[PDB]
Amino acid sequence: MPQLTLDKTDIKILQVLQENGRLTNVELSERVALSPSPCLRRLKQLEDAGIVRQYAALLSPESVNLGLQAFIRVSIRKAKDAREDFAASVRKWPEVLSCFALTGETDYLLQAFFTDMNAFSHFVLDTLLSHHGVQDAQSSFVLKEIKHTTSLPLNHLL
Amino acid sequence: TLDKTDIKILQVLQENGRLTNVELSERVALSPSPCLRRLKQLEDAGIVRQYAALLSPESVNLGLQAFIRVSIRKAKDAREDFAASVRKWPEVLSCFALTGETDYLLQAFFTDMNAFSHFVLDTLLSHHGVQDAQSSFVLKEIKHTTSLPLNHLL
Amino acid sequence: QLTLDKTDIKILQVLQENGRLTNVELSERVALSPSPCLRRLKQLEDAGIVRQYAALLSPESVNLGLQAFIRVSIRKAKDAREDFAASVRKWPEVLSCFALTGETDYLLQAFFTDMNAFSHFVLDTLLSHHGVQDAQSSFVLKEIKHTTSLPLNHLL
Amino acid sequence: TLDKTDIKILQVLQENGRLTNVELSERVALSPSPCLRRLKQLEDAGIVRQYAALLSPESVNLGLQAFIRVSIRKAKDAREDFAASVRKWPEVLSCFALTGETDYLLQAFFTDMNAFSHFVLDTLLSHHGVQDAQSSFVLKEIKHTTSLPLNHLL
Amino acid sequence: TLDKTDIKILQVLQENGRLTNVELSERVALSPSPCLRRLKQLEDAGIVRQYAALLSPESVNLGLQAFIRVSIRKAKDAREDFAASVRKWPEVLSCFALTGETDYLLQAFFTDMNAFSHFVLDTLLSHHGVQDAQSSFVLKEIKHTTSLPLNHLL
Amino acid sequence: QLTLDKTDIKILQVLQENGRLTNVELSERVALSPSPCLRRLKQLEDAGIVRQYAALLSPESVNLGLQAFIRVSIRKAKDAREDFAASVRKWPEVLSCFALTGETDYLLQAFFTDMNAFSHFVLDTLLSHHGVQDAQSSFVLKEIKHTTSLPLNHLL
Amino acid sequence: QLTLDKTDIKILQVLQENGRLTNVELSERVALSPSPCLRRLKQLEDAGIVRQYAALLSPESVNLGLQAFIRVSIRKAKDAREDFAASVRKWPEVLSCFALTGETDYLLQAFFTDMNAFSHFVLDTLLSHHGVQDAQSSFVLKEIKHTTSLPLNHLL
Amino acid sequence: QLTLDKTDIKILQVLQENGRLTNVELSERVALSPSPCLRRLKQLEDAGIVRQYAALLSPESVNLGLQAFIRVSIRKAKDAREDFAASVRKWPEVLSCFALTGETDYLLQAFFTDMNAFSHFVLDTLLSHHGVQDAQSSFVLKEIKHTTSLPLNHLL
Ligand code: MET
Ligand code: MET
Ligand code: MET
Ligand code: MET
Numbered sequence A: 001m002p003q004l005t006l007d008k009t010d011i012k013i014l015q016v017l018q019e020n021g022r023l024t025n026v027e028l029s030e031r032v033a034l035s036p037s038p039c040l041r042r043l044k045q046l047e048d049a050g051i052v053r054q055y056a057a058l059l060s061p062e063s064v065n066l067g068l069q070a071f072i073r074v075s076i077r078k079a080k081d082a083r084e085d086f087a088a089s090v091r092k093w094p095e096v097l098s099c100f101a102l103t104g105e106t107d108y109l110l111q112a113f114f115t116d117m118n119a120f121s122h123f124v125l126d127t128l129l130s131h132h133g134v135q136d137a138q139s140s141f142v143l144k145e146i147k148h149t150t151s152l153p154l155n156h157l158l
Numbered sequence B, D, E: 001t002l003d004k005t006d007i008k009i010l011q012v013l014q015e016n017g018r019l020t021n022v023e024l025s026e027r028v029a030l031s032p033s034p035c036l037r038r039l040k041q042l043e044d045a046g047i048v049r050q051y052a053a054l055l056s057p058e059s060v061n062l063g064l065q066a067f068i069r070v071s072i073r074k075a076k077d078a079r080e081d082f083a084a085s086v087r088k089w090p091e092v093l094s095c096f097a098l099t100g101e102t103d104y105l106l107q108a109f110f111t112d113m114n115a116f117s118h119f120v121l122d123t124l125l126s127h128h129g130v131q132d133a134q135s136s137f138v139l140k141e142i143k144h145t146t147s148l149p150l151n152h153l154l
Numbered sequence C, F, G, H: 001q002l003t004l005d006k007t008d009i010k011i012l013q014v015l016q017e018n019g020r021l022t023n024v025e026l027s028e029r030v031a032l033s034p035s036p037c038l039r040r041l042k043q044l045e046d047a048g049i050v051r052q053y054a055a056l057l058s059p060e061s062v063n064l065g066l067q068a069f070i071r072v073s074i075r076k077a078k079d080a081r082e083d084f085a086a087s088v089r090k091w092p093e094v095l096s097c098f099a100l101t102g103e104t105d106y107l108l109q110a111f112f113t114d115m116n117a118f119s120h121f122v123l124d125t126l127l128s129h130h131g132v133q134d135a136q137s138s139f140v141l142k143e144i145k146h147t148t149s150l151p152l153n154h155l156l
């Protein structure tokens, strides 16, 4: 468990790395009041313990022409492995960044990104709705990004 | 504008953000000094907005990830207040104004359904701007990446 | 059907709340002697009025923290209805099951330890059952009220 | 912390709640005295909330089991007044604050539809904090038990 | 031909279907002789489709009056089979094809909720054509009349 | 709250279908003695069973081509419910009004000449009424069945 | 009123597809001399059948590449209906607008450059209008068919 | 591809409202000599900018007094989409059809003379089509606004 593996300073480590993910061990060492050796040791425990799963470069969709962030609610037909064949193909679609099996009226909620609405129609008509397992889709689109952080809260571990 | 090599840099760094300039230069088929100019251009051009360490919710005890469908009152100071308030809720990671049935969509994280209940009943719904909420929960993470698609730039 | 009296109702009304009372105690509550009281309580059991006595447990005390109310709708065949009802009775994590009016056709009441527990039940058991066409599940955030006790003032 | 015979006792009593100590002990591979202690602890520990006689709705003329979905208007203490009122309504057996479209969900019992109409129109819908109500009725009780699952502790 | 007096007739008979031609001829200001010519021509032109005795549903023990919204499976004949089956169900008084979410709306009467369940569960839902159903019940008759409006004809 | 003789039901069954029948013609459709057939109505109508005898007309024949079913929800202000009731009673075009269970609070069954007639009613009368929060109107495309006759075999 | 024959419906039908045709051409297609064709056409305008001659453009060709249908709900004020009507009429991007039956009270058809533009309109114009309670917007993914042409063969 | 200028748009804006103008009448309005203006317009037609000149009619003048906005759901079988598309294109009472985002997959604009006409269509042609799973129809009570004119100022 994290209270019997992650002490106060490790939590600050993940807090800083979550936000400035490309620091060097020494930059981080300066950031958490620690000698470069044990700091490195700690950041290695966390990476091997599964806590830090990935370091990534986050981009601006608008800058790379992606104007239309769509949240699509999908329902899967009662077929053999409709679930798994949908799941298999959703991982192959680069435009679809995330997919989740949700509670409620919808079975699946997908988070996608596209350039313009024409782009989106060809994907919805020719890929999503054309897929044997996909029974019905409902697409909504983002009008304003009020908030967007990859950072999880860690004060519950304290 | 940016060329096929600038698109290879971004594709690569989206997956391994911490990747070294030697390694990066190698995969993008460029020398160390010149390719490190592109990456600095790109960072200085805003294309790359942040470098982040992505964590595993299970590992840090956030075993409950929710999507909450919220709607604000027909008010002037309801819009900004809810926004200003969601920005200060660390449990709440993203928030969006959607088209369609619901006006706002929140994506947040919790430990247990108990943690959630206190948040929804004592923070969210008691916010003067919030008119109604409707929260669903993630049963199975089929796919989740922070990597944007870049083939359209080719 | 058994013809009930004022004392007969008081007995039920006592038993529903404290169902482990000794007959000596139940007799003194409802203002009766053991012998008569015992014959009543037995007549009330005989009649089918009392269907069972039950020890009621605290869900959180036994690690079930997540209480799901699940709206199910079953496939349209002259078999899915009985198969689903048959399976529902074999599922111990589901306590109640009701065929309802309105949008949802079936309503289930189920208890689980965590949300991950639910995910296995819904994905691997409920929604893979040939009869189940769709599910919509909610969760209890706060128990405002929960009694097992039926009202009996309409009999007086 | 509950062992194998602590759990089985709970299993036995959840079904046959009025057993003698002697016939309870016979059903758990335990002698009277030990079994009486293991039960005492379970009660003092909060595990056994109460012992209740379960009756038949049909038996006592209650032929209409309604599951009602009500929402509450946004006003100071509307939820507390609803809660406190629903606790003094004997026809209402249980009431839960829920995730999803509905704010609340009651399970009520009535002699017939006329009885229901009077409750809904002149007590539920007339309470100040009650904004809306959607009632549905049970057509067939496929399963009903009070007995919680306990095989997760084994 | 539907001049004022022909409407004064229709209006009166809708309310008092049983009225004597003497009394009818009096309320519409006509000698009996032509009042009986006019009415017969209304009876034989189709206008008056039926004279009917309207009964109190509670009086004959049918307390439960339902409104069911039914959708037929989209195949061949199903539409006709559900139609013809609905015509042989005496508890179903009216059945309309409506616009909107639901495809058919049924008005039906029952003795009690138990009588309703048998019907929904063993007839309505078990009919090969019926895809699904959604039943709502009448808590109070605010108004009910068989009299059409006819002012527009004036 | 009772049950009547086998042919006493027929009296109601016959009258519901042919309501302006002569007691002579009635006594011939129920196998009842001539004048004692008038005696039996003298017990039914003279009780509460028969509420009214009415002339049922053809909507199309009197120009009423459009029959709407309107789902109306009511504002929760002080006695807004009786206000609505008080007004639906006065609107001739609205034939029947019921307080339903489910999503919508009230259901109205109305008749109109054409859609323009419905617009004026909906905009200028229904939705402009102080108690009416929302309305949701659906129209009939085809009358599969319509009888004013109740089932009476539950009484045998 | 006018009495339209097969020649006159042919006039309107040709004009509906080809609005700009020369009077000589029009008369050639519709089997009439220029002299009366001209009269008959002007009779259809003066009558009110021809309400407007218009050139219809391709949205994409004018960068308006985002067509939205918007379902709007007016709050219950007294003037809310007319205020919204008035403001709707001044909004050029909103081309048509309808009081519909059903769940939605108003249906709008609008054209925008792209979602950014759409966001500005909903957040800063539509939802900030005092009489507007709610907005549920959808977009066109594929234009299967779109004509201004009405069917007129029911008049024959 | 052609670039549009301040004058070019005026030609667009004027034509959109007054479609049947003569070339002389258009020239003396956009600040262009008759000869240039002639060509420029033909290049806009040829460029796809102006897609069709139409005479627009009054529904109520030609007895089409029921405007239905229909929401259809297509059966997701083997290319049922193309079939519905191909037959929607033949149905004259249907002027427009769109693949929408959100609850419904399709949205139709239809025009009828009355409810009888609508019934005949929805029951015996639309819902009897093999690709059509569900249909949900509404009707306009009031046209607040209707223009064919697109906005063009975003090009200035
Ligand atoms: C494959 S995810 C299933 C979700 C489930 N039916 C629910 O909404 O509760
Ligand atoms: C005919 S395409 C239908 C698209 C679907 N309604 C959506 O929301 O994505
Ligand atoms: C907070 S912005 C809400 C937008 C609205 N849901 C729409 O569909 O237009
Ligand atoms: C009375 S608590 C209401 C909870 C809220 N409707 C939700 O979905 O989270």
Ligand code: MET
Residues within 6 Å of the ligand: E097, E098, E099, E100, E101, E102, E103, E104, F141, H122, H123, H135, H136, H137
């Ligand atoms: C049985 S006719 C069905 C009509 C369809 N529900 C509509 O609204 O258009």
Ligand code: MET
Residues within 6 Å of the ligand: C099, C100, C101, C102, C103, C104, C105, C106, D139, E120, E121, E125, E133, E134, E135, E136
């Ligand atoms: C399995 S019984 C289903 C009944 C149906 N949902 C109704 O509303 O009447």
Ligand code: MET
Residues within 6 Å of the ligand: D120, D121, D125, D133, D134, D135, D136, E139, F099, F100, F101, F102, F103, F104, F105, F106
């Ligand atoms: C106008 S009474 C409304 C009753 C409410 N719709 C219910 O379902 O209980």
Ligand code: MET
Residues within 6 Å of the ligand: F122, F123, F135, F136, F137, F138, G099, G100, G101, G102, G103, G104, G105, G106, H141
């Ligand atoms: C602004 S008119 C609203 C009409 C309403 N939606 C109905 O169905 O009757």
Ligand SMILES: [Ca+2]
Residues within 6 Å of the ligand: B100, B101, B102, B103, G134, G136
């Ligand atoms: Ca909404």
Ligand SMILES: [Ca+2]
Residues within 6 Å of the ligand: B113, B114, C065, C066, C140, C141, C142
């Ligand atoms: Ca809890």
Ligand SMILES: [Ca+2]
Residues within 6 Å of the ligand: B063, B139, C115, C116, C119
């Ligand atoms: Ca999990």
Ligand SMILES: [Ca+2]
Residues within 6 Å of the ligand: B132, B134, D100, D101, D102, D103
């Ligand atoms: Ca809600």
Ligand SMILES: [Ca+2]
Residues within 6 Å of the ligand: D113, D114, E063, E064
């Ligand atoms: Ca009743």
Ligand SMILES: [Ca+2]
Residues within 6 Å of the ligand: D132, D133, F073, F102, F103, F104, F105
């Ligand atoms: Ca409601």
Ligand SMILES: [Ca+2]
Residues within 6 Å of the ligand: A117, A118, G060, G065, G066
């Ligand atoms: Ca487009």
Ligand SMILES: [Ca+2]
Residues within 6 Å of the ligand: A067, A143, G115, G116
């Ligand atoms: Ca944007």
Ligand SMILES: [Ca+2]
Residues within 6 Å of the ligand: F115, F116, H060, H065, H066
């Ligand atoms: Ca009209």
